[model samples]
Target: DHYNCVSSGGQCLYSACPIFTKIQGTCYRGEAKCCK
Candidate 1:
């Protein structure tokens, strides 16, 4: 798989993540931003 995200790392979910979630990088074909 394409594991090219996260300076910290997350569960690779949609953007505008839940509270206190930091954006890591790309995910799901760049459809969603990885949340850390």
Candidate 2:
């Protein structure tokens, strides 16, 4: 729901790279700086 919320609600850039695969919704990164 990362991309959904962003496009709908206009929140801050949720992802680091904004990948195509299910990275933000399904998988967990343990840290907010998953993109870096």
Candidate 3:
């Protein structure tokens, strides 16, 4: 249902993405952190 993270040109990482990439939407059950 929630795929904005992917559509917005953002990547879904495991956890604690990074400092450079800005965090965006968190779409999923496993808490896939979205970063662009």
Candidate 4:
């Protein structure tokens, strides 16, 4: 439940991409970056 280009099932666009660690959030296709 954090910032990333997640799938419909809520998976990360990049496997190396971090998940729910920095207390961030999500957005649409171009609204935000998938990773830091």
How do the residues 1-36 of candidate 1 rate in per-residue lDDT, one tens digit apiece? 137664355767764777887766767887787776
Give the Å shift of residue 11 in candidate 1.
1.3
lDDT string, candidate 3, 1-36, tens digits: 148886888888877768888878675775777888
| Index of the highest-TM-score prediction | 3
> For residue 22, what is the lDDT in candidate 3?
83
TM-score of each: 0.54, 0.25, 0.65, 0.21
Query: What do the candidate models score in CA lDDT, each in turn?
Result: 0.67, 0.36, 0.75, 0.40
By descending TM-score, how would the candidates be arranged?
3, 1, 2, 4
Deviating ranges (above 4 Å) for candidate 1: 6-8
Pairs with backbone N, CA or C atoms under 3 Å apart (clashes), candidate 3: none
Give, for candidate 2, the lowest lDDT window spanning 10 residues: 27-36
Predicted structure with the largest lDDT when compared to the true one: 3
Kindly report which residue stretches of model 3 are placed more than 4 angstroms away from their true locations once superposed.
none
Q: Candidate 3, residue 29: CA error in Å? A: 2.5
Pairs of residues clashing in candidate 2: none
